[model samples]
Target: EFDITVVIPTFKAEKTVGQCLESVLSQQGVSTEIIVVDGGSPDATISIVQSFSSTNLTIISEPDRGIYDAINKGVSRAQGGMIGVLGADDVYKPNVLSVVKENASRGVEIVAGLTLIDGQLRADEQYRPAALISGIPFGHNAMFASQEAYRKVGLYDLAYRICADAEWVHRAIKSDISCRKVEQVFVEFTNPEEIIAEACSVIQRNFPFLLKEEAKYLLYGVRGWGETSRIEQILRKYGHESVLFVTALQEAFPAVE
Candidate 1:
């Protein structure tokens, strides 16, 4: 079996699918299966993926239920012990697979690292498992799961269109699967707030006490934190750092926390 399978779900992602594939397939000296599950894009997504000649590349094209559905299809075909999901517009950092392999060897079934959004390192402050009770402790695109863990927890919940990633990770944590934080930037996202808002929605769904009004307030609070986060500003200004600074907002907000 392969060491890792990185699944990328795409739909008319002509602008950045190639870049995403390049970043994922270029990890040096790693045994990885890169699966591109396209949602029948009426664009050149297929052609762009075809340009890449990595022996590990697997491209599946056809209409699907949604992004989560596309990802489930990719997982079904994965030949590796570990599964990672990357978006069509996202890119992986150099040596990410190597680091993932190193962490997996340490007996952790779930592995996650940092991420980059608009050249700024983005990761959750909730690295510890306990953080999930209050908020999401991991980024779905930035996290990897062992096949055994996937078999135990199952696939993403299609009902939660925007919050499936959080639901899935929550299930993994609740099941007591082992995880490790590599502290390396594993994935890159162009839009940070959009992703954070979706994460907030997950928090809202998972925690019913967060009524709709309170959830909106929580989003605004997080935005304020993003604007004033001294550590985020410093890290983005300089180079990279862990996500310790990002978790303060969740801690301060009583509804989510």
Candidate 2:
């Protein structure tokens, strides 16, 4: 029986799926299973996942409702005590599963680890001997609770297109779902287009507030030292400092280290 199920949802990430799968397969845990859910890719993504052909790997090819929907299906089918979304473009670092297994029985209902953006491991050490990652929360390719939380939380709300992950995290926190932040690169994230694509629509939708909160919550890791001044610069650049949106982040979170 595997200890964790790594879910990789793909649409057209054939260019990087193979390498991403390779990294997951190369993890040090012996009882790890990979489930790749393809969202009807026209490219060679299906075949690429098939090329692995190991019992440790399972491929689900079909038309999914959305990215979060694809992840929901994977979570439902997973038998592991823990669930993690690797996506098709993300990758887990070495020995990530060993750490997951060690902490599987902790008080945490969900365990999240550090996600290095684009495989560039920072030279500066985050914490020693794989300590708990503590800072402002950013939902990258982090892990989540097992089937228990899945059943309770009932999957990501589909109404949210690009921000369901954030909503789900907030739900978990408000619902008192126990969570821990582990200090290690269990995954790497590289979907850079999502940000630039949603600027104008954010203001149009009257979500300038949410946009700023997201920026603060999501960027604390990469820009931990000074967020207030940084947020001020952002507001000034947009000529919307009169609105003063992102300061809500200060109310929402503690003083990040």
Candidate 3:
């Protein structure tokens, strides 16, 4: 029983997988198993992982439907009580597993922490299920769910290539899982577009009433009367106009970060 099982889904990630592995292997105060799910990279990604020489490291290389597919494969093989999906280009901060372990011991089923993205801290918000209606409230790479939570939520929906994580988080939050936020930074995320439409799709599918209200507001908002923004164009291209209005409104007026 490892304290955590870290899943890394990779494709042509030879440039950064080494640092990613190093950061995971160097984690302190908690037992961990690292699984590298490579989608037939055809590069040195598998070879570099092989050179790591850690008994706790496992590698699976083959073609997959997408990043979330690779993650589902890894989760099926996870043995730890807690599971974390990290990107091939992302790295964990020191002692991330220890923090997770501490929180898990306190009966927390979901753990989220601050993430460093583009030199700014994100996913630092207190856990609020309502926040998920607009977007992902936590950093994807900086969050961990218990094995039981995964069993309950099932796998990622392949239909959402860009925002399946958001969908999964929505399901997890709605399931009433106990969540906690650690003040320390847990991961350094690497990378996105097409997110607003996908996020709106999640909202539309899960919170249609909220989407309707937001759409009503968008129809009267100033931006709704003006030219379309890039986000609006994408939403229109995807036939997601139900949310395009509100999405464009948010783009026109972004929150202070």
Best by TM-score: 3
**lDDT (Cα atoms) of all candidates against the true structure:** 0.74, 0.64, 0.77
Model 1: runs farther than 4 Å from truth? 53-55, 128-130, 133-135, 190-257
Candidate 2 per-residue lDDT over residues 105-215, each given as its tens digit? 775678778767655643332211111112214444766576677777778766656756655654555465677678777777624456423322332233344354444
Q: What is the lDDT of residue 75 in candidate 2?
A: 79
Instruction: Give me candidate 1's TM-score against the actual structure.
Output: 0.76
25-114 per-residue lDDT for model 3 (tens digits): 999898899999999998999999999988789899999999989999999999988999999789999888998999999888999888
RMSD of each: 8.4, 7.3, 6.9
True lDDT of residue 32, candidate 3: 93
Structural similarity to truth (TM-score) of each candidate: 0.76, 0.69, 0.80
User: Which structure is stronger by TM-score: 2 or 3?
Assistant: 3
Give the per-residue lDDT digits (tens) of candidate 1, residues 1-257: 78999999999999999899888778886788999999999998899899887778988999999999999999988998889999988888899888888888878899898877887776375544334433456667889999999999999888767768777886776677888987788888826765556656665654444445444454445434432324333224322222332343335443442
Ranking by lDDT: 3, 1, 2
In model 2, where is the ten-residue run with the lowest total lDDT?
127-136
lDDT of predicted model 3: 0.77
Q: What C-alpha root-mean-square deviation, in Å, does candidate 3 show against the real structure?
A: 6.9
